[PDB]
Amino acid sequence: SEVEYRAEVGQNAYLPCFYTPAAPGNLVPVCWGKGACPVFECGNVVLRTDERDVNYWTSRYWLNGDFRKGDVSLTIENVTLADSGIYCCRIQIPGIMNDEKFNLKLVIK
Ligand SMILES: Cc1nc2c3cc(-c4ccncc4C)c(Cl)cc3[nH]c(=O)n2n1
Ligand SMILES: [Ca+2]
């Protein structure tokens, strides 16, 4: 088939996303959203970070990894079938036409 991430209703879903900062504590803002990265900025936004901290989140969506070291992987808690679909993790590297865009397909059953 093709790369996908899987969960059963009631479980947590785990969607990977990583970048390497230039030096520790020098973070890059990240945009997580539902929908593919060609849509707006990172789809329908569910979570954002900036250079210093998490600045936006939606209930059930988490960065539980070490995001100050570039692990910006997403946890979606207590998934339902409506959570299936493509998600966008966008690494907003400073500068123009240089973002890293990751599209992650989540399948719930
Ligand atoms: C009461 C509550 N708080 C959060 C929350 C907090 C954070 C967060 C903020 C700053 N530093 C580390 C973290 C993990 C994130 Cl990323 C996601 C979150 N999502 C969520 O459903 N809730 N709910
Ligand atoms: Ca950029």
Protein residue whose Cα sits closest to atom 15 of ligand 1: 62
Q: How far is CA 68 from CA 16, 74, 76, 89, in A?
A: 15, 14, 19, 16
Q: How many separate helices (H) and strands (E) can be counted in the chain?
A: 0, 9
Q: Is 62 in the pocket of ligand 1 (CB under 6 A)?
A: yes
Q: How far is CA 91 from CA 9, 28, 72, 80, 86, in A?
A: 29, 7, 9, 27, 16
Determine how many CB atoms are found less than 10 A away from the CB of residue 96.
Answer: 6
Contact 30, 21 (CB under 8 A): no
Contact 76, 84 (CB under 8 A): no
Q: 71: CA distance to ligand 2 center in Å?
A: 18
Protein residue whose Cα sits closest to atom 11 of ligand 1: 54
Question: What token pair was written down for 52?
Answer: 């210093």
Contact 92, 102 (CB under 8 A): no
Residue with tokens 């959203």: 33
Query: Experimentally, how was this structure solved?
Result: X-ray
Q: Which of 45, 42, 44, 69 is nearest to 55 (CA)?
A: 45
Instruction: Return phi, psi of residue 81, to 5°.
Output: -60, -25
What Å resolution does this PDB entry report?
1.7
